[PDB]
């Protein structure tokens, strides 16, 4: 059991688009003195269920109803954002992060959760430097999102499935290996057209294997896109870009992250 009184505010961590986020101590048993991230909600940004157990998805520990509000207690993730940490660099360092991402993402998909706008701020590191996906339940509206990371079917307000998120996954991958985004204009609107129309040019400094994976991920038609079938990331995991990845050691957090916080 829990209520707001069970938790003492230490500091506000941020006040983003998808809510206000406090660091808290639990003072109640059994997890006395354990730090969490609290997030106060309810009373643009709607919600959907969450009880997710995955090494690369944020755990909801508690969630309770008090004064016509909804509090959510979650892993306190000390590592910060993935992108921040890189901005302080190998293809082998990225492949670790993309392997872990793929496993968690694929887990959200099997539960029916789909990001649409999956962006770098949704991917936090923990103390050890393993990734944790956040902010997957939500849903801004008046659907709004960050256009750079959106698949074509999504930009076009057509239907979408989990394939949308492997497009985004390619964008993240591309952004990591290059420091640039694959489609960007001066405007949200010019960016949208490049996503629909521009045939992406492969940077010729990427491995032949990374370019293989990016061409596979960047299919305007979801049905041609890698991961698009119902076994999802089974297709992706088998790609030669991840030859060096023992997917079972990875899930068990037995592979040393390349950067230590
Ligand atoms: N479990 C956690 N959940 C959310 N944020 C956390 C957590 N642990 C630490 N943080 C920190 O708190 C910040 C609050 O982010 P938040 O307001 O939830 O993001 P957002 O709305 O997804 N971002 P944006 O892209 O700007 O719309 C994070 O970026 C981290 O600095």
Q: Cα separations (Å) of 246 from 93, 95, 233, 239?
A: 15, 12, 14, 13
**Stated resolution in angstroms:** 2.5
Q: Cα separations (Å) of 189 from 76, 186, 219?
A: 37, 8, 20
Q: Which of 7, 10, 16 to mutate to test the pocket of ligand 1 (most atoms within 8 A of CB)?
A: 16
Q: Is 19 in the pocket of ligand 1 (CB under 6 A)?
A: yes
ω before 135 within 30° of 0 (cis)? no
- 227 and 162 Cβ atoms separated by less than 8 Å: yes
CA atoms of 32 and 18, how far apart (whole Å):
28
Nearest-atom index, ligand 1, CA of 119: 25
Rounded to 5°, the CA angle 34-101-84 comes to 70
- 99 and 250 Cβ atoms separated by less than 8 Å: yes
Give 73's strand partners: 38, 62
Nearest-atom index, ligand 1, CA of 15: 17
- 100 and 250 Cβ atoms separated by less than 8 Å: yes
Q: How far is the CA of 21 from the centre of ligand 1 (A)?
A: 7
Enumerate the domain spans of the chain.
1-80, 81-261
Q: Is 36 in the pocket of ligand 1 (CB under 6 A)?
A: no
Instruction: Of 234, 225, 97, 98, give the one whose Cα is nearest residue 161.
Output: 225
CA atoms of 105 and 99, how far apart (whole Å):
10
CA atoms of 134 and 130, how far apart (whole Å):
13
Q: From the candidates 3, 47, 51, 117, give the one annotated as an active-site residue.
A: 117
Give the CATH superfamily of 1-80: Phosphorylase Kinase; domain 1 (3.30.200.20)
Q: How far is the CA of 222 from the centre of ligand 1 (A)?
A: 29
Nearest-atom index, ligand 1, CA of 21: 14
| β-pair type (19-26, 35-41) | antiparallel
Instruction: Of 115, 103, 110, 102, give the one whose Cα is nearest residue 151.
Output: 115
CA atoms of 169 and 214, how far apart (whole Å):
9
Q: Which of 134, 138, 146 to mutate to test the pocket of ligand 1 (most atoms within 8 A of CB)?
A: 134
Q: Is 118 in the pocket of ligand 1 (CB under 6 A)?
A: no
> What is the second-level CATH architecture of the domain 81-261?
Orthogonal Bundle (1.10)
CA atoms of 119 and 171, how far apart (whole Å):
9
Q: Rounded to an integer, what is the distance from CA 188 to the centroid of its chain?
A: 21
Q: SS3 letters for the chain?
A: CCCHHHEEEEEEEEEECCEEEEEEEECCCCCCCCEEEEEEECCCCCCCCCCCCECCECCEEEEEECCCCEEEEEECCCCEEHHHHHCCCCHHHHHHHHHHHHHHHHHHHHCCCCCCCCCHHHEEECCCCCEEECCCCCCCCCCCCCHHHCCHHHHCCCCCCCHHHHHHHHHHHHHHHHCCCCCCCCCHHHHHHHHHCCCCCCCCCCCHHHHHHHHHHCCCCHHHCCCCCCCCHHHHHCCHHHCCCCHHHHHCCCCCCCCCC
Q: Which of 12, 17, 18, 21 to mutate to test the pocket of ligand 1 (most atoms within 8 A of CB)?
A: 21
Q: From atom 19 of ligand 1, which residue's Cα is the shortest distance away? A: 16
CA atoms of 133 and 112, how far apart (whole Å):
15
Q: Cα separations (Å) of 261 from 136, 147, 219?
A: 23, 30, 35
Q: How far is the CA of 124 from the centre of ligand 1 (A)?
A: 8
| 117 is annotated as an active-site residue | yes
């Amino acid at each position: 059991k829990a209520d707001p009184s069970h938790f003492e505010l230490l500091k506000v961590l941020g006040q983003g688009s998808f809510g206000k986020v406090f660091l808290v101590r639990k003072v109640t048993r059994p997890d006395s003195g354990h730090l969490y991230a609290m997030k106060v909600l309810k009373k643009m940004e709607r919600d959907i269920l969450a009880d997710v157990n995955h090494p690369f998805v944020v755990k909801l520990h508690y969630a309770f109803q008090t004064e016509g509000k909804l509090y959510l207690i979650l892993d306190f993730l000390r590592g910060g954002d993935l992108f921040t940490r890189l901005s302080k660099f190998t293809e082998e360092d990225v492949k670790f992060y993309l392997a872990e991402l793929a496993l968690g993402l694929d887990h959200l998909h099997s539960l029916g959760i789909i990001y649409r706008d999956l962006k770098p701020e949704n991917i936090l590191l923990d103390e050890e430097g393993h990734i944790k996906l956040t902010d997957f339940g939500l849903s801004k509206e008046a659907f709004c999102g960050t256009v750079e990371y959106m698949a074509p079917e999504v930009v076009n307000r057509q239907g979408h499935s989990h394939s949308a998120d492997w497009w985004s996954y390619g964008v993240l991958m591309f952004e990591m290996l290059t420091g640039s985004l694959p489609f960007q204009g001066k405007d949200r609107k010019e960016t949208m057209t490049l996503i629909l129309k521009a045939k992406l040019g492969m940077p010729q400094f990427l491995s032949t294997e990374a370019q293989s994976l990016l061409r596979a991920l960047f299919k305007r038609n979801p049905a041609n896109r890698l991961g698009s079938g119902p076994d999802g990331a089974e297709e992706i995991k088998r790609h030669v870009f991840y030859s060096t990845i023992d997917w079972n050691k990875l899930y068990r957090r037995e592979i040393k992250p390349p950067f230590k916080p």
